[PDB]
Amino acid sequence: SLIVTTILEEPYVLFKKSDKPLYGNDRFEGYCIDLLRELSTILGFTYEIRLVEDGKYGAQDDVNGQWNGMVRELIDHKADLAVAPLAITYVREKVIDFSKPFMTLGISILYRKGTPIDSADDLAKQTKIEYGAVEDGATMTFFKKSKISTYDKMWAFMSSRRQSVLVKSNEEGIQRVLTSDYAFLMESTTIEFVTQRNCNLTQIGGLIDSKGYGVGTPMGSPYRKKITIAILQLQEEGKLHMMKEKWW
Amino acid sequence: SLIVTTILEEPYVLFKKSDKPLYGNDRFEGYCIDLLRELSTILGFTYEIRLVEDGKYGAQDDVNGQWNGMVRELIDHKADLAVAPLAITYVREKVIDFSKPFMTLGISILYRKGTPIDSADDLAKQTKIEYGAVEDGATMTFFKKSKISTYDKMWAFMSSRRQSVLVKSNEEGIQRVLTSDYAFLMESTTIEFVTQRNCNLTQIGGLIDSKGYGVGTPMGSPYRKKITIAILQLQEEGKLHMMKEKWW
Ligand SMILES: C=C(C)[C@H]1CN[C@H](C(=O)O)[C@H]1CC(=O)O
């Protein structure tokens, strides 16, 4: 019986609503929950869902070199699978395995409508409008690791004000955008979700890069291939598209 | 020194044009050639390029269960890598390994501009306008394996006229579109390339599904992970985007 680590994130994973107390895996619904279920069927496994305890996706501390969050749990064999909006990044592929992507997205900008801002560059070359990303995120990491002119400057900007422009959750990042002169760097899929519930927000510019989400397995895990096949199957039969329709 | 199987296909791989004869790996240029080179560097390997002998990507005979083309070569350890516009399909993941995708595309329609046709459905529900795909392709296989109402219909149509509507190459498929009442089912990226060199063609409707291209390795190969890491880096540093710009 497989230990599946994950994390709360609308509409990927979230506590279901009801009137009478819920226990175990019934506590959860969401796109990733649906997906977990489909894989569960196709590959014939039983599974226990656990929320990652530190509440983080996965980042590496420069100095000591330790990993945290879901990625850490995978490394330690404390979980068998990580099923979340976990980005397939190359720093991560060096420590865990990933199924082929069940979703392709990209970094982009969340800002309110009708500003002159039209791209990442327009943000970089000024200072009035602040900007940031989820701290220890894949998105933040992209900027930290980037030797592209524009993004290096934008990183320089953020790392110098992390106290105030780097947020701890996609929610908090959206709140900043809505309550100050702030533009948020988040994933396109999540932007696409938010720009429905909030009608004064929009995606500025296009996709900055092009990552995917994948199922996290400890390195060398047999399920990496199994789950890749299952996912390829789910794409090809329209179920993944249907599932996104459903939650967006 | 790695044996790399591949296949001629504009602009992924093609004999380079000059005034003097070229030999060995100099014979070739193209997006995949550039890619091969970049991987070559990052992972430090030497390689010999061979064109797949039967001239096919990879399909499985329905009687004897045998594989052909590049996929076959990988299975037989006759080649170490397949670097081509080779689609990551689940039937294939069942016999070889694939790097994560260096390109994401989708099946779509190539037809003439200004027809009432606007989708795969509009094609299905009639017979005047014929349609087809590359025989033994990923695209053909998609329809043959599909249980979706519309596409089962379209498959029924093709398998009944397989001789006259299933073509042997992307080129021949385009030639049909341009010389008869015919709509072609090809990959979006290749459509995107063709609709520049031919100004009366266009993509009808949207992406029908959502596959990627990956580097083919024999199952259990060390390079699958290595090459996945190398590709992830190449995406993250803009090189893959630049490479597409260059060849499109
Ligand atoms: C929900 C957040 C915390 C996660 C989700 N994907 C990215 C990841 O895999 O790290 C993070 C977002 C980001 O950095 O934009």
Ligand SMILES: C=C(C)[C@H]1CN[C@H](C(=O)O)[C@H]1CC(=O)O
């Ligand atoms: C160029 C053709 C023959 C190949 C390329 N990708 C698909 C494959 O990987 O089979 C085939 C095209 C298609 O079937 O639309």
